[PDB]
Design a protein around this ligand. Structure first.
Ligand SMILES: */C=C\C(=O)Nc1cccc(Nc2nc(Nc3ccc(N4CCN(C(C)=O)CC4)cc3OC)ncc2C(F)(F)F)c1
Length: 292
């Protein structure tokens, strides 16, 4: 009983963009930094291009991600700019210059303040709440799949596995392949734990075959050193077995937004107050100001 998806899918000519560098590499496909110029529009857009050789099942994976990226518009979700129909189909999205958030809290852990951490949790809940409003389920929410546009502004990404990573899975998901927005709240909880530990690996050492039994006993990830019981309690609530008991993303916005209004009451970071995080570029425009 759903509404017609009238999102526009833009096909871009290979001539419209230049690849400047390789950002990330796999045999399946590689990600490039690059610039894109709409043909008649006199702008330059910093983009990231995802692309190697193609099994017939390979192209069906990238197109589902493009279908999902093209139907979302939210300040905290990565937006598709278009696709290019060269022999290996290219997905073209907005360049998130500071890279992936997991890598970012590791590289800068000694300059990351409680106000940023609480803002990222707010921005991520907003993204996920937008996804729940649009009746979507991520299935792979993790700090590795949140990208950093500025240090003030993160966006959720990786919709390849989206529908309508065992250490980020919900227990119901691990036992019975069940996936909900509430199962997404679980991985939200694990995602916040990664940030509060500056990128620590959850259940480090423990093999994934062991994860299902542990969680049944009642064990959970431990309270991060910087976390007041308020923040840690919210994580723990995301990890209830009864999924109706986990919080909704709209409540996580409210709660973490309440805490982002006085961040040092809720995260205790040594020296928290002192820390601060940052051709021709004349016709340059960020994707977020390029509207169609
Ligand atoms: C959590 C790991 C991860 O997702 N890493 C990653 C690596 C490559 C591409 C993407 N996807 C992506 N990336 C950007 N922006 C981006 C990522 C990484 C860098 N780095 C780190 C590594 N590096 C070298 C030389 O070793 C170069 C700098 C830089 C940038 O942007 C300048 N933007 C968008 C995506 C997207 F998700 F694919 F759209 C993720």
């Amino acid at each position: 009983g759903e509404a017609p998806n009238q999102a526009l899918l833009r096909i871009l000519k290979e001539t419209e963009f230049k690849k400047i560098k390789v950002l990330g590499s796999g045999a399946f496909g590689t990600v490039y930094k690059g610039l894109w110029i709409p043909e008649g529009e006199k702008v330059k857009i910093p983009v990231a291009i995802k692309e190697e050789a193609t099994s017939p099942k390979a192209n069906k994976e990238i197109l589902d991600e493009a279908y999902v990226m093209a139907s979302v518009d939210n300040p905290h979700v990565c937006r598709l700019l278009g696709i290019c129909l060269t022999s290996t189909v290219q997905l073209i999205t907005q360049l998130m210059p500071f890279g992936c958030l997991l890598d970012y809290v590791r590289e800068h852990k000694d300059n990351i303040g409680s106000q940023y951490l609480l803002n990222w949790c707010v921005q991520i809940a907003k993204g996920m709440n937008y996804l729940e409003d649009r009746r979507l389920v991520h299935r792979d929410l993790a700090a590795r799949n949140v990208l950093v546009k500025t240090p003030q502004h993160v966006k959720i990404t990786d919709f390849g596995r989206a529908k309508l990573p065992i250490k980020w899975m919900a227990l119901e998901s691990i036992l019975h392949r069940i996936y909900t927005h509430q199962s997404d709240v679980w991985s939200y909880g694990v995602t916040v734990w990664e940030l509060m530990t500056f990128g620590s690996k959850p259940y480090d050492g423990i093999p994934a075959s062991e994860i299902s039994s542990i969680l049944e006993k009642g064990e959970r990830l431990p309270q991060p050193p910087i976390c007041t019981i308020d923040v840690y309690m919210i994580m723990v609530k995301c990890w209830m077995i009864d999924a109706d008991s986990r919080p909704k993303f709209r409540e996580l916005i409210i709660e973490f937004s309440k805490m982002a209004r006085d961040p040092q009451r809720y995260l205790v970071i040594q020296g928290d107050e002192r820390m601060h995080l940052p051709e021709d570029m004349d016709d340059v425009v960020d994707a977020d100001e390029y509207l169609i």
